[model samples]
Target chain A: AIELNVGRKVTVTVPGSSANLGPGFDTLGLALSVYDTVEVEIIPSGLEVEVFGEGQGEVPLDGSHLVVKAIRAGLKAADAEVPGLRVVCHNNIPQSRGLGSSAAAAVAGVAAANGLADFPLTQEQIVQLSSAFEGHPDNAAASVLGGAVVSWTNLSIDGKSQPQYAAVPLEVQDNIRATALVPNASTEAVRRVLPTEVTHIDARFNVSRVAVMIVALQQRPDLLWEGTRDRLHQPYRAEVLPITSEWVNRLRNRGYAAYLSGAGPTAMVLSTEPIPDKVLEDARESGIKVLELEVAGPVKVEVNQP
Target chain B: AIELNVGRKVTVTVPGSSANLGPGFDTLGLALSVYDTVEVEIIPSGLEVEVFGEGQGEVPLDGSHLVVKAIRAGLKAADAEVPGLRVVCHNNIPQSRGLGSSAAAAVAGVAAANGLADFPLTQEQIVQLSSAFEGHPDNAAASVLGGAVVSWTNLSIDGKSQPQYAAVPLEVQDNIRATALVPNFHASTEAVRRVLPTEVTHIDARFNVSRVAVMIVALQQRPDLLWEGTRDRLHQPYRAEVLPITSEWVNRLRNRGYAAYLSGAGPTAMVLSTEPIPDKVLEDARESGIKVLELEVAGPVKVEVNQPHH
Candidate 1:
């Protein structure tokens, strides 16, 4: 066996994700081209976290940062003592843009911590632990599983808390492009505009649409054009984003599937190919900025030592 | 060539049907066990019609009778002059019982006339002409096609009015029993229809919404629990007076695979079955003096005339 080094440095990169692709609503999420890199080293210190890239000025650089918090949480869940380490994060994902910035950091941190801890834990344990910290499974699922993930809240046979995720293949992933019309605004402002409760009809409509969306994704992509149309949360959230209706209508008329990403202020459109310049030009003319992105293949894990 | 009789006699039996099987509301209909037989004999005299069975007391035997009227409509649509004929009718289907009694008469009359007219008209023409008389294509579709049918108002490429239908196979038909719990009083269709509000949440629900209650449940139960599966929304609620406890009892029972069907009009309930039930056990229940009738299969069409060249 090769001699293991106790003090070797290593780095892991976790891609960012976009949650709620149209009628997939709460179930579907896709990892984008952007990523957050975490560098880990076996130091003679307790723990250290350094932040860089978008929102580094606002993101916590100490143990309170999401990366460190996730590392500690992973250790606790595995019933293992915290390992002495140094973590440096370079976040390329935009903050508060529904681009899954927090999920990337959390996934990268847990991945590095698990690597540093000699992987005494399983991949599923790390996923479950990361999902528990993220509050919702959409972003966590996509970041951890990679490609496109269709997740639903369901109970295990024994009634244990678990998330079920079905990974959409890379071929299906290659056929789709995700574009975000993110406004330069705070996520808090958008969250305030949404109501706490939704109507029954709206809820049922989404349920059916979600089912249709899954079938469309699996069986027929032509059906995907119609399947992704939603009425539940998008319409209500559109109240805050005044330009959303025009932008959405323009895309819809051109035969593209688009909806508000996650909540609002940032609208995401899904298509079979990279968004055409004409579609982007229409949005720009309508005063909506566009960021075209595609889904990453799969999340890769690397083990390193200091 | 076979010699043609100048005054040949032939009998046409058209089965009664139940329309709107659950979520396929206003779109699906299935033929039942009961039938209305119309025997036609061409004569040199003027038109004449006779009525019997379920509608004997109420139906007019004169020119005003639905059978006579339907025959006249068929002949006119075919662009042929009315032939002098004697129409002997045996109507076993209950009138206005939610079972397609009117549709049975219309289909029987048209088919009988066609047979007498040496089948000059085609099945497609019969469907088109019958739909014109009955107002809806669902009942007329089952009448022409036989068995279960799914009809939809379709638009042609040039935007002309058209109807489409698919005949559900016997495998699907043999899986469940359709039961009709008819009441004593007539459920006025107009009065019951008044309660329905236009525009429903059907688009999102899709075809599966109502099909789950009807097809899926019926398939699961096979032959006994069909009544539990067959449900309706457009007309059943408004006609509750005809069989107030029907919907309730259907829901309460664990019908193995059989389903309850609404016979035409209010007073008769038609039940469907895949397996045969003992006669005594089938007649045990009485809802306000309304008897229960069970049928093993939706009756088949008489494809060949008994006497070929009379």
Candidate 2:
């Protein structure tokens, strides 16, 4: 059976994340202040789904909803069963814009499930489950653990390929702020533009930049420009994400540490000092939505209310 | 006329370094406690070269010696010259075994010249001259600035392919100790480098990128992360076939849960640990004829100036 209360309702809040941080590619992520709030309740009979804000008209209200699927997955993992579920998402994180809106929804769902089931899963368990659902941990782990994270996927185990996700949170410097210039932007399969092979020198270039970036995030803000320079994904992705490439180059040329957010059309910037108002205004004037946000903490679940 | 002072003497002490730290191939370096001390003096006339230690019989004793050439380069950079010189090298760092003996020699020479010429060159200039001499900055910069450093070469300058070297030292955690498992053998750099492929899979490139980021964090604050940070795919896998002995030690130590890596163009392996590797393991390595050196993080190159008696 379950921890089966008839009308158990829990609310979950998760921050959006920006992944593929500079040279880190699919390895780094930063949680931002914008969030998605989910309220999940266990009912006696069929699934009920309600979506407000971002995906209200566009998203399906069914078992296939991302939040509903994630909630079932979490409950099954904890050996708990729900007869029917009432799921409501009041979303603020922009969908399909490379701002990790889906990851936030997934995190909120799983976090709510953990809450409804008398909290059996550890924080690490939450990360493992959410990240597995996403096929990569960068976005999900950032939303689960917040701050900034360096995540990795281990695909070989005992000579067989299996996906095992893990991540470690970095103690990011307090003054570092994130700004996303989300183009008002996913055609699926954008990742196909990247090459299967890259020159060894270019690989080493990214590796060097990764080292510089960790140092920048931890203690040396001055090195952020050099640290964020990447030759791996950005160059190849630019042809497909031309608008993002242009803005990324523009910001970088003016000495802001701007990089592609995920496999993106969103250009993200990280800085310890304030970005000039004129630069922000220019991005807005060019029809890009700007989100100036503080680094966020992990996804949170509130007390269960009947 | 050369502006160099006559009858001035200078002594320089520079630390040995371990470069190509783990995933950071050609990019990261760590300064170690082993050293080479050089004494240089302006003579009235005629060249005198004295080597009292490791390379006494092996190294050339003339103007072509690495230290001598570096001294000249440094002096030239400062617009100073000396009329003949007396050079003495007291070497302790193992040569040609992945420990940076040659780079230390270059730093020692240039630093000695800076002392004799009243130190007109800035630290950055000294790093540039010394690193340019070696064609890479990882080893030279660690010896020049000490601690762990991230070094890079810029080969593109205003559409012309000119090499410029630069580096920045990291604030390493206090407890991090470096141990070098120096073998009684050597591998030439060219032979080792020629084995690497020009292209790597995009997956491996991303793997290395993540590991180096992990490495910087490991060096700065998390000793527990050392092993994961040191997992590299860039050079070591290909080099393992070429330097089987070094590779064996690296694999052996890593299996035992120590953060061991092939130290540069090896034959010498290195481990960075907060907890000392057991004495039993050290003795075992010694039994295999591997010379074990327990070296801690070292400070930058040291120089002392002395006035010659009239």
Candidate 3:
């Protein structure tokens, strides 16, 4: 019911993120330098949408599109409505190879809505809106806030089992770097392989490593290898994701702190120093695309009122 | 055979520690300010032992005493020999009730041995020796290195499950304070440990892990998160039935917004906070015969040596 902004245009850019980040399954994430950018403009009557780059050919051009849905959600939460809208997306983040491409899309769209509606939502609200798209917050929070994030879901005791998502950004050490070895192909059914319960020893292992992970992120770069050790999700995921598991094991055997990025198929390695050329070369020879990324800042928004 | 120092005297002091700090289970401990001091001297012929303060009349004064055995182990490890010993203990830490009195004793004896032998053992070696006295490293490592320590045991897969223990100290925040509400009766650690099941539910394990991470952040920078960080589902719940009084105080204090937890296998309950617990609560606890001590973070063991024969 707010006043109509006839010609308000906004641009939003959000980074790709890697969730799980070794020991913190469903809890930790880091934003990468790779990004997806989108532009939204208020129009007169009908809806128009265009997509380019990664998801262009396969995605819907209607209101059902993920970005469009996110935009609508964000706009509704802010109590602002636009007559009609135009959306354009220029995507560089890999599409659904566990590189957080969907989370990036959702973040970009929600951020765009916040920008178009005179920026009513805070960063926390933006995260809550975007993460609701996925049942978890790790990926969405990283894309929303950038840097490294420690996120958790609090399930309510109420009958509805309403869940609340929250996160805090860690002060990462300066010299840490991230490299992603993304395969050309992707899968959607990987989450089905996870077991509903796990051993007590494995859980304890992850808990200790999570503590070590925080220490490594904060001050001790030497502990990265030890910190990234996981006994929870990655080992169980290895049975279905052979290629990702192989590369992760090979890299770790050679003293690199490598792990399965998100659900699978891409291997993410974090280190305080540059990964050796031989390792990168070997990965490239095996038909994997290598992306060297820096820790990125939070999503960016620019509004142009005309 | 290593030659002996006839009249070498060494005095050592070690602080008590609290292990399993909330959800950390067998992995975390923090050193407290209360301590036990012991003086060891090499004599010519026979062994003489004297004890004062906490364990004055109840403990053994013979070669089988825990301190004497610890001193012998330290001397053997350093490849030094003493014909006889005179040991005097001025104990301030409680003998039991999970204040780590035994760990303090072990650390004190080993430190004295290191001092008498011209300080041969490294801090790491001291930790290994003292921790071996107990089956776990949490209490000993904290007493050896002070501050808050994160310790783990690595088991050998080669036939014999030999464990190698190691720990790292976290740089604790300056403002953190520790308080112990120690009951008069002591609980046997081994007997209490039997209450735990070998396997736990996966959800509980995950919750505990998250709390451990939260505890590290709380110890390092976020004091406001202490109460939340101290939430545990692993050891404390199972231990509650055996240690009902400690469980009662832990829940009561937590409900009152204090970060209270069972101290090791305890009848003692410990609270960590930047601010003090209410004076009324302290007075009430005291009237009920619980000894309350407000302890600050303490440093590693202290050793002073004098060689009269030199």
Candidate 4:
């Protein structure tokens, strides 16, 4: 009874996410079709790793790998010793393009570790851990919970009044499709160029727009074009990715809901269908590649079927 | 046939509203049970006014009265002449206090005039005129739309681009009650607004923006979320000087797991609770020399026989 029946080989599928859809800023997130898959072998003490794609040669070969570290952390939390492990990563999600690749890795690691440990941790525990590791919940939340979500870092009255991060899932239209225009620049580069201060008038504009966005997303998809205009992040950081502002406005004018994906360099849009040929051509001129993403559901950890 | 409707006496009643609703400053509004009733006797051209109860002697007796002015403006749009009118303002709503007395007056006058002016104006036209006069739409929208609403003015593109003001009606859980602590001092909304700085930090803006979305959802399905939902970062802080005890009351209620916020400009603070507000909150508020009034979301702009200050 002490050591529960556990699957020695487990496969974890964590979805990629687009954070701050439209004016949601640090609040909204949507899970996308792209993914990062992790497979692990639970053993008695050392570790070996293989990365077949994406960050392959660049990722750590030793114990410093993010997934391995997370597995160890998970095992420690359940009062279990760090076990020997063999890990394999088949990555499909793009890295550093504002599509939440790092967050996906962190979530995949925590989820994979929990699955390997005979499922000792609960779902809430996974959410808490992944959100903390990422420092913000938008991307991490969608990766774990799927669908659309509004999350925040709440400063609750804990014994010492510490900040507690939490997330709530919101219902979005089923017909809407999310597509991203991936560019050459990294999210970090774009984020670095953002202005530190924004005026109160501009702030009011976004506050009102975000609230209206929920209404538009929930009931009136027609308002999406007008509703998704943002003043918070996209405008200030648009200079880093010069094409972002032009494309966002272009897509919106063409009657689609579009905005900076995560922190820019990558632009995301929500429409009834995949972005059309005209937009694809326009984007190509600016060196942007557009991908039609499938809607990803909640994270899954299952036994490797033999 | 035209004269048959010209002098027809009509009455219009609009509820006083509480705007801001915390983080929803200039964005959200809740219509309250309080109201101002205006009855008009339309004739051929000179305007006359009589105010009873709330704003009796101090109110204007001629063309300058807010009701008279609003009615004339509405008729002017219909390309109709301002017929002589005798108006009675049964002002139950307290004037210049945070309870949206001016907005209610503006709406009441416009509605009464529109009804008398062959009903040529649509609801949209009435809303536009009223909001422009009030210098803001939060209070104006609530009084016009009734119940709770999310309102905004949008400036978008201009091919066929006409600017628009829209108010979407929101649902509030029926069990939740809105109670206000009314102080004797009148808050000149204009004066309070003038004190606010033009620029605010991006973080505070995000803080309030997040709260606005939370407030929208909380009011509809989760009353338990009000305390968190109603937290505001704009206007209220800068006006803390005007309503010093407001933040104190807001903090106390929030700590006790109830929602409270400055009702509008200043002076009045509204609390939302299912159970009666705790005895301590009431006592503490009274100690600051304010009285508590229990109210709820109102129905549409109604018309009835002069009931005189109910």
Candidate 5:
């Protein structure tokens, strides 16, 4: 009975990521526990869809959905023909919230199709493809790898095999927890407001902070207050999301490490155990809901190639 | 008998430093095994001098001597009046070779005097004073702290209570060692620095900042990453003519996995490695008659209060 379903059913879960992480700019990513789960099984007929949680009416229940798109792309890459596909998405991730919902969807579809088809591509190679498809590596990397990441395209390093996407996995210390303050902001409007060119001094400021930020993340979490600060994108992008800049300054005064979460609207604070409640009150006044979350482990696979 | 000789006869050993260990650009300094030893005590009248090793007749014996000036500065800071002083300088570091000889002297005098007079100043504070006295911090910090350090004035961290000098000690991997190619060019710090531009482009600044930041991770013994980590967008390109073959030689060595950087302002090149000096690298230096020496990372300056002589 089980042999008949081989290469026909798969379930994949992918974690959401928070990018930037302050001075790391387009460089660091942290995976959150919030995830999007997609279960796919081939049928004899047309595209079938089911959705639960977060994007019910918003995300389509048809072939136009991102999950279906990624599944087709993965099947095409695997040299397999999908006669018909059915997907049941239990998406817990909030869409358009800078929580990397799209990244999670992309990774889930790629992983699900590849696993179900018994495709021979390494997980790293899968992430490489998924990230290229997503157009940004930060969230794609964290969703695939789990934990914290320091990523850069080798463009910064001159000569010899440049432009390869490289990410160095960093260990997130046990005590460092994240408290996310979700507010409403448009990622596109936020992107439109960013300056094309930054001053040399401002770039250097970010460089020093990013270097120290690496040291602080791996070795000294206590230094995160000054370590996570950015003078580059955070300042320029904050002009549109002024509440973001205000909340960071205010939250920092309350002695918590905070920043605009990955292009803003959502403000995240990295802090020690026992999240401070009154500071949450301060962040709440600016229109936000706080979630205290533990640093998530790697993504879990429920079933594959079944 | 020993009571009468109080506040006398202190010997100090100071390490020569390699500055700009890659992209750090005056922010990073590494202490090497080569050293300069100086012995000094208060004498009743004349200044007695004995010179040995690298500097002989060339170094001044009187008040103009860098060590003696530093000693006097140290004693005066501690409120001790030194009417006369005797000196014996055992110098192994070559002067004006970009090997941080001047910083060695400044640290030596201050360290000897501070220890002899039982001066109450933190070693870090003494380094702060010595580096201020020496006009720079690279050599002073490496000699004072021993090992590698990232030194900077906190002018960049914007806020109230700014402008304090700070140095954070960094780790260099056990396998990595410094092999110096000391050339014969003598470029003064002033001329070497004068060639550098007052303003640089934004791209160059970012280039240096990223590389220097990467170096800290690489120097923790990631030898594979050395080539890109040691690339600098700062001073060496400007002073290329000052030391003709230096940049090419550095480039050649880096291609082979050896991390090479300018020792100081001009002239000397230091390589951090675990591999023996390749014949090609050594041969390249021989045409220029640059002497090659293998050295390990040196410890901090030592001022042992020798037990009262029997």
Candidate 6:
């Protein structure tokens, strides 16, 4: 009989990220300061789980959830057998709202599992596995690399899926702020509103903007203002999140860099520095609630020394 | 009668530039080491001009030539009357071959006229006026700025044309050498662009974003395994004369840095770099003879001491 380390306890904090920041539609993402924490205590028994804070009423408290699935996946990838463990999640991010709540949960679960399993797997392997489950790698990439990340979906020669990413430099990272504009709605509604295909002109416009956005992040940070203009996915998704386009235009016209965050419902503004309260108040007056947050690096799990 | 002083003669050297270097299509241009020398003598008589070198047989020796037409436009913009002057041009640039011959002539003409007319106009005014005459501002902007220039076309609210450019920094400028591969044939830019499609796909082609993001100077200086992937538009249409797609693919497979410059319109591949040439293999292996030339920045012109400092 295998005797598991039952008394081991760990805390995992995963940063929230905003994906598709303007022209980077499905390519760029930034890790923000807000976090969702998960506490795990290894127990020599059947799995037990508890969830609190943001998604308490809606999130699952059993082993058949996304977080649990992620944990099991992590254990398998690390070549370790599943150990009976107790999980406690303190969620601060909203669910299905384009703020990457699922990503945070996924990251937290895997990170906690890795710590409990003696960290047999590298962080890159963990990120890649998580990305495979997420479909697009932007959110998972940012969750792993921190700051700003650019990810691309690579189709294998035999038509399998591969994802890759590069981290934007800290100097460029420091010049921008991401303000989340969360609406009181669900992201599923927004995703359902988009059409399957878009016109070629709209596609070309976004392509040029993406090029400008990438170049600005690497060589010309001042050009970021020009980079945040998107026309392909945002407008179509805006049909479901009606206020997003209005808020984006308003923020941009008022001299702030803003764009649709991920699929919809949540909008993110990339500003020059920390957004002042006056700007927040101005955005509120426009009927868009704002949460001004600074970008953060990746969160690492530390062993409790006490 | 208004008598203009026939002052000391001056020679102005303007560097040739290749425009639309890859993914920077219609936006980026850079100055090269190749040059066109323009000698201006303030003769107190009717305008007498002479043309020598590359296309001397075709260019006019009177006031109706490109040099004179550009000078007249510059004088009109500067609110100055055309003074009696003799302009002698010894152009080594290959004309109508997409090597920036027209841009060099326009730059040399306007620059010489500014000095001969006692420096009556500002540099910005000269650039704007020259761009208006040249049809596109990519080459003209680089010619004026003396290094790698990234420009954007901005249309005013009333639909008037305006072109703006920013210079690439010096450290980034020092690492690469720009080379040109010239075929003896010529393709007019208008005819070349007639075959292009009106729309493109929205997926931000990775080839373009990756290269444009790296900055031209950085990309040129570090011609690693990834440098050959840059893409472009606005120059490579399906026109048989300008085979941009074929040229780009060949250059990419050869592990070259940046794409072949439509050097304005084609037949010539203008490439950028920092290191010395590895060998003359490209020249010998071509279906048509190719010439590889090293490029450098052309500094601003020096004014004649006798000319009035207006």
Task: Give the alpha-carbon lDDT of every model.
Answer: 0.61, 0.82, 0.82, 0.74, 0.72, 0.63
Error of 1 at A197 (Å): 5.0
Candidate 4 segments exceeding 4 Å error: A1-7, A55-64, A156-162, A187-196, B1-310
TM-score of chain B of 4: 0.87
Residue-level lDDT of model 5, residues A33-132, one tens digit each, is: 8877788887653344555563312212211145666766676666665545567777777667677788778777777767766755566666665665
Q: Tens-digit lDDT track for model 1 on A95-164?
A: 7767887877777767776676666667666666676666556787788878777765343324665544
Candidate with the larger TM-score of 2 and 6: 2
Task: In model 6, state the lDDT of residue B57.
Answer: 19
Model 1 CA lDDT for position A39: 84
What DockQ does each candidate score versus the true complex, computed on alpha carbons?
A: 0.00, 0.00, 0.00, 0.00, 0.00, 0.00
Tens digits of per-residue lDDT for model 3, A1-306: 574476899988889999888899999999999988888888754444555563312221211257877988898888877766677777788776777888888888889989888888989988888888886689999999889999986554357855777899998998889999988656567767688888999999999998998899889988888889998889878888888899999888987888888887889999878888877988889888898999988999988665
Clashing pairs in 5: none
Q: Residues A1-306, candidate 2: write the lDDT tens digits.
A: 464565899988889999978899889899999988888887664455555653312321211256766887788777887666667777788877888888777778788888898899988778877877677689999999999999886643547654678889998899999988988756878878789999999999999998899889899988988989999999988988887899999889987999988888889999988788888888888888888999999998986685
Give the alpha carbon lDDT tens digit for every residue of B1-310 in model 3. 3756668898888899998889999998999999888898877644555555623213222111567668878888888876656777777778677878888888888888888888888888888887778525898888888999998888777858556778899888999999999998856557677898899999999999999999989989998888998999999998998888889999999999999988888888999999988899999999999999999989988888766543
Model 5, position A198: C-alpha lDDT score: 78
Docking class of 5: incorrect
TM-score-best of 3 and 6 = 3
Instruction: Residues B1-310, candidate 2: write the lDDT tens digits.
Output: 2555457998888998999889999999999999888898876543445554533123222112567768878988888876557777777778788888888888898898889888889888888888877535899999999999999888876776557778899999999999889888756567888899999999999999999999999999998999999999999999998988889889999998999998888889999999888999999999999999998999999998877545
Ranking by lDDT: 2, 3, 4, 5, 6, 1
